Design a protein around this ligand. Sequence first.
Ligand SMILES: [Cl-]
Length: 158
Amino acid sequence: TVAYIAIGSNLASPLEQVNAALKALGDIPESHILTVSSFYRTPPLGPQDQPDYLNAAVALETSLAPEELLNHTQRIELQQGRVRKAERWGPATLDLDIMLFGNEVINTERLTVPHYDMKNRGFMLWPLFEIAPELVFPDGEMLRQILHTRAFDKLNKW
Ligand SMILES: [Cl-]
């Protein structure tokens, strides 16, 4: 099944953090990276001297169940994020989100698919449109139309 994963990081030097996260993604069992988007840049809110976020989307072929894939994205966040030596929330983070899983709709306590806010986030939708321009969401919404009708922040490549 094709899953779409969002990767986000404002950690350290973020290019190498996202490349590491990509490698770990491809190391997930029964799962294969099909395509990766360009890398995009999201500035922080505020005027404050804070690191920019690097955003990407990945198409991952997987024979795992969605909750299994979740286990693996949660593990990588821990193993590759600054949770142990810092905090869960901590301004600085590595985020791995399952945006889409096949045409599945999953509404459970530990997993909601499609990701609950992705239609509102340019930094998820634009990279996704780069690698899947003909995508249609499980509810029948066309990705191309959402991009013509919702207001997103300007989003430059990294
Ligand atoms: Cl949907």
